Amino acid sequence: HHHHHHMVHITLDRNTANSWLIISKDRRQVRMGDTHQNVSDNKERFSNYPMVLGAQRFSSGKMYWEVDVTQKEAWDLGVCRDSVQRKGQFSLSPENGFWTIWLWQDSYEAGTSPQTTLHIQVPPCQIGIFVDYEAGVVSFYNITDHGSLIYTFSECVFAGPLRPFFNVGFNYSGGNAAPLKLCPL
């Protein structure tokens, strides 16, 4: 792909984070803590899952960023509507305002309803995410495999400003403590 020139500098929004997440001082890394991180509750925080939003809001244009997922067993990545539900249980779907892929139990899937199996021969250590607001496209790329396409959501109905979306996943196994990291331009 040739989307690299639309690179944007993404930072994480502490105020949206689940209360167990630890965001680095530079706001470029997030990981699961082993306990509540001693923050006050607010209506923006994801309550049920280890999720956080980027600070940036997109309502036009073409945007590209990269995320490091090295050594993780479980995660979700993509983009969501600023007004997604924060509290309680919900599925990741375009009907609920999410355009995402994930790793879970050694398989990769796109967050369609119902979910779609992905075909990845080279497990990615870094994921590229491309958004074309006007075209209604969200695409995912395997940076470890020379940028190969993972998945394209097309005919997207964003219906609002978009925010970068992250889930570091639970760490019930003791094998999923590693962070998500926003990779340098």
Ligand SMILES: O=C(c1ccco1)N1CCN(C(=O)C2CC2)CC1
């Ligand atoms: O954004 C998308 C989309 C892009 C790719 C796949 O779906 N959609 C379609 C599914 N949706 C609905 O059907 C709405 C409940 C009516 C929500 C918008």
